[PDB]
Amino acid sequence: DLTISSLAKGETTKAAFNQMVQGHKLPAWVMKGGTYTPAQTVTLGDETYQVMSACKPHDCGSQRIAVMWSEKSNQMTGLFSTIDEKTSQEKLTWLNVNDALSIDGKTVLFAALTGSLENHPDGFNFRS
Amino acid sequence: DLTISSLAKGETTKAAFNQMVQGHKLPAWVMKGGTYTPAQTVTLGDETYQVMSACKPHDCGSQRIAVMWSEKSNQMTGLFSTIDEKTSQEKLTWLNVNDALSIDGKTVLFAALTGSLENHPDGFNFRS
């Protein structure tokens, strides 16, 4: 199955995944892609992506990640979120490296890691 | 017009607004609600809200806020975002005080302050 973890280990996707996280110092669990939500298909403008998410096993609500990957162009963008135990403040790290992400793409990644995308599989299609 | 600023000054909304921001030390511009996006109507489950947003004049992309207010119950929830000049990391502060916010409500507030809600006015209705 297509998960953040299989993308991180895949022969033809691993270097792209390593570039996406390059310089971001993300937790080991992301690559282990243990607890994950099934990939959903989302369309932005005139391109389609598989949007996936995953979170820290046994502390899922505290650390989570979302990735948007185009099976056609092999291109991927992501978002990492950590919630501070002390303030409940949420710190987001955008995994861009391409500067290709749009406002809707940011929203779709946030919907994925929060859980709205799973709850409304076809509610985040913004076609052109 | 209905804006975060009019809610902050309104006779019957100001105490609720002051409670929402209580203990959060937000910038002065929020109450001045200068640069704002028109209110949009959004339905979550079986309740409707006016979702509004605003941002820091002349540095709009750096500091922004979204608020969801029910004209019927006078209840409001919000989200403040600041983007670090140094890392581009985005820090979110949830204005809850009621613990009433759902996963979809978090998504709708994020869509509002990012701009997706304005670009897709009726694309964030999650009715029950």
UniProtKB/Swiss-Prot annotation, chains A, B:
Keywords: Disulfide bond, Periplasm, Signal. One of its GO terms (biological process) is chaperone-mediated protein folding. GO terms for molecular function: lysozyme inhibitor activity; protein homodimerization activity. The record marks 58 as: Important for lysozyme inhibition. It is found in: Periplasm. Disulfide bonds join 55-60. GO terms for cellular component: outer membrane-bounded periplasmic space. It comes from the Bacteria. Strong inhibitor of lysozyme C. Belongs to the ivy family. Homodimer. This is Inhibitor of vertebrate lysozyme.
